[PDB]
Design a protein around this ligand. Structure first.
Ligand SMILES: O=N[O-]
Ligand SMILES: O=N[O-]
Ligand SMILES: O=N[O-]
Ligand SMILES: O=N[O-]
Ligand SMILES: O=N[O-]
Ligand SMILES: O=N[O-]
Ligand SMILES: O=N[O-]
Ligand SMILES: O=N[O-]
Ligand SMILES: O=N[O-]
Ligand SMILES: O=N[O-]
Ligand SMILES: O=N[O-]
Ligand SMILES: O=N[O-]
Ligand SMILES: O=N[O-]
Ligand SMILES: O=N[O-]
Ligand SMILES: O=N[O-]
Ligand SMILES: [Cu+2]
Ligand SMILES: [Cu+2]
Ligand SMILES: [Cu+2]
Ligand SMILES: [Cu+2]
Ligand SMILES: [Cu+2]
Ligand SMILES: [Cu+2]
Lengths: 332, 332, 332
């Protein structure tokens, strides 16, 4: 009887950060309430000033990570304000039935809806918009995110001992297919609707023009680099709603990796690089052992360094010469 | 001594259906006899009426699923009637030696041959045509299928308890590379041979023009949708002979997945999406919990919704509001 | 205290062969010393005489396999002679910190450097050049290889019993992106530097013009085919520094496969085809059961047979009719 269950309202935060939560559940099952507002907005995605009409959950690409526990109920109030122009909905890969909620959440501009589903399977899962007949257009315009459903007793290693993370980040990787004129310059449009048929042609090439973390080339760099300290245990959740990716931490590893993101399976150990299939979220756990700059990339290095799929960690602490040292610095 | 073993003749059925078989073996090892006839035929693959010269085992794309048990012998009579124009053969990934039977099964039009091999490894495996110097052309013209080699005691879960399916379907996913003129219209040819050099150029782009389940855009929809009932246990065998795919059941999961299809390994649990590498067959087990329409797709959603890699299940039975419910229907 | 550890100098050999080593460690931890010389050289990559300016470790594509044990120290003297024109460095995916050694090994022509790192994780790992701002160009010009870090007690199967290989081969798979003029003919340049901007455009298509094993179309064929005998246990290490691949032994299997190459995980059994993500090394163990020619391919068969990703084994010994036999040879 759902009426006798506690409700808890969560306010979401912008990626790559994640809302506050407990790893090990401190309560019985709850109805966890979330609200998201759909925003269609102009987004500048590269250093050249290329602009697209992005379609977002809550103003960000990706949409925010939602965190619950196994056998909680998720109740999502989804709002499409009348400032938008398109019909939208939501499909949770975590949910069972009705096209993941897609059949039940069709909202025109000016409408809202509330969906509830039981989180029966633990893991990280993609969610994404999926309106009838324009599914890939919405998804590849940025309308996707992820939800993590923790087991009620937290994460476990391959022997079933606890794994406790100190920090968690969410990296959403996005393939864009910006239409091009005859010479190869990116086209500009006043509304999303204008772009529709050129978008379809661009997608059909199967060749993205940009592949980015957190909505833009260089988004997870500089002042916006992810941070950690030597000794910290970090969980990186990574999603790709449409296309395969292969994350790699340059200078590090994935100590424990759920590459297809489902926590009832044991993790793969000591990964250099792992494959997250399109339409999947994965998760990797690493303990930092050396300070400095690390690059986190899609290890198709063209996709990383030319198309944009690269971010940085900056890690503080003490250098360990046992692990690595320059014996003779570069010299004639 | 093979002469003292029982023989059993099996008549194959059209995909997505699968010939009758026992999961748990009710006999000792047998020689299982199959016959296939090669058909070169014109196939219409999309709603626009695009036509290719398909090369088929038994008239279908994919070829039919063959089902045996571990340590049976498979004896295949392969017929190439003199109405065809090309040399063909067969390579079973399930078999050991002679290029999977390819070296021993070269048949010109008007010839036949009988191959026998022992099924030593349990799993689902691709089979495909592979004639010297035109391997990808034959395969990507539809000349592939799969064979399932069940363990003699049926399938097991990750703890080794029995898994029994109530229904089984075979989804063959096919990448086509239809040649195009300068403007981008699909070309037409009178014979397969005419197309050869344009086919090679089309393949080399590595960009398929269509990606389809069961031989055509929309083949597993409408009257041809796959069916099940709430509570039923369904095994979907999925093959791709040439290119990677990432299946996903929209509104469902892969409860138990052998993504690379080999049953001595434990299955991955609770998958949202899984990667089947090109040249592989995989298998996914799901128990339906909600009625309605489900879409089964390649979750590169461009490949699904624009290029054709999407089918439907229609599931009958009772709606469970505990799992999912609309709390507030879409409204102003 | 590293000064009290034995040192051992290893001389590397050309791929596909691998330097001599012990599977089970016969000594305690050592400092293993290697030397590599960077060579920029003109390479002919196909039968048409297409030429590129390759960038190599030790003169080969791939660079040589290095073999150590878990918790050895690797000490690499890296030399960039003043006959080269570019700045180079090295990133080991096996190492921890400083961008895998990349931050510490930047050498202009005429410089050398010595790096030491501790091999803390067992597996096969990619190494590759990664200079600031031209990472994919160097990697996709051939500047990559792999290192294997054996567990001190050798390899184990999925039950933890020993697996001992009789032979080991290293297959490096390389994606090239040779620039093309308007009509589609490959361009030629006098220096590597000349090619830079055309290279970037070619890479951005994400479409390789060639995909080869060991540096050229047909390199592992004819007199250069890999060899084995029926009954032998063979380990094939396969790396791809930039793009996904899906190896398959035609006529065989991967009996034990570490597709993402990390030996603390149990192997997948009985694989037909397996996925090695870009930026990864994997390893497959097979025991030959039939003599003859086997083709080892990337099972995107366009990539294999049209673009070059195919090699051969030639296996000697006795034919086993129990496993496979022609019952009726091809006939009218
Ligand atoms: O500015 N909204 O697409
Ligand atoms: O747009 N909410 O009524
Ligand atoms: O679906 N492309 O990885
Ligand atoms: O194909 N996805 O990198
Ligand atoms: O679901 N992969 O851990
Ligand atoms: O009509 N046969 O290709
Ligand atoms: O074509 N059969 O003899
Ligand atoms: O081989 N293409 O997935
Ligand atoms: O690359 N296959 O979707
Ligand atoms: O072979 N994969 O279960
Ligand atoms: O000939 N050296 O690029
Ligand atoms: O190039 N070595 O000094
Ligand atoms: O990154 N391409 O497989
Ligand atoms: O996408 N690599 O075959
Ligand atoms: O790391 N894969 O065995
Ligand atoms: Cu939308
Ligand atoms: Cu989806
Ligand atoms: Cu054929
Ligand atoms: Cu094959
Ligand atoms: Cu270099
Ligand atoms: Cu790397």
């Amino acid at each position: 009887d759902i009426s006798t269950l506690p409700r808890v309202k969560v306010d979401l935060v912008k990626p790559p950060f994640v809302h506050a939560h407990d790893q090990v559940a401190k309560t019985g099952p709850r109805v966890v309430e979330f609200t998201m507002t759909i925003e269609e907005k102009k987004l500048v995605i590269d250093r050249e000033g290329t602009e697209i009409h992005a379609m977002t959950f809550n103003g960000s690409v990706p949409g925010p990570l939602m965190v619950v526990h196994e056998n909680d109920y998720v109740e999502l109030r989804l709002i499409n304000p009348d400032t938008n122009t398109l019909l939208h909905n939501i499909d949770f890969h975590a949910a069972t039935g009705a096209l993941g909620g897609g059949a039940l959440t069709q909202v025109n501009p000016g409408e809202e809806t509330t969906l509830r589903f039981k989180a029966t399977k633990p893991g990280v899962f993609v969610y994404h918009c999926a309106p009838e007949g324009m599914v890939p257009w919405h998804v590849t315009s940025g309308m996707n995110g992820a939800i993590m459903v923790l087991p009620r007793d937290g994460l476990k290693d391959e022997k079933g001992q606890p794994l406790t993370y100190d920090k968690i980040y969410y990296v959403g990787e996005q393939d864009f297919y910006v239409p091009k004129d005859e010479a190869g310059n990116y086209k500009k449009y006043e509304t999303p609707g204008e772009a529709y048929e050129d978008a379809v042609k661009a997608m059909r090439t199967l060749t993205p023009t940009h592949i980015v973390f957190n909505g833009a080339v260089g988004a997870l760099t500089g002042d916006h680099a992810l941070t950690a300290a030597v000794g910290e245990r970090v969980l990186v959740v990574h999603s790709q709603a449409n296309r395969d990716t292969r994350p790699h931490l340059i200078g590090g590893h994935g100590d424990y990796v759920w590459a297809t993101g489902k926590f009832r399976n044991p993790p793969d150990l000591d990964q250099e690089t792992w494959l997250i299939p399109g339409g999947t979220a994965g998760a990797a756990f690493y303990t930092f052992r050396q300070p400095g700059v690390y690059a986190y990339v899609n290890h198709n290095l063209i996709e990383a360094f030319e198309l944009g799929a690269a971010g940085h960690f900056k890690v503080t602490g003490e250098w360990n010469d046992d692990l690595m040292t320059s014996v003779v610095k570069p010299a004639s």
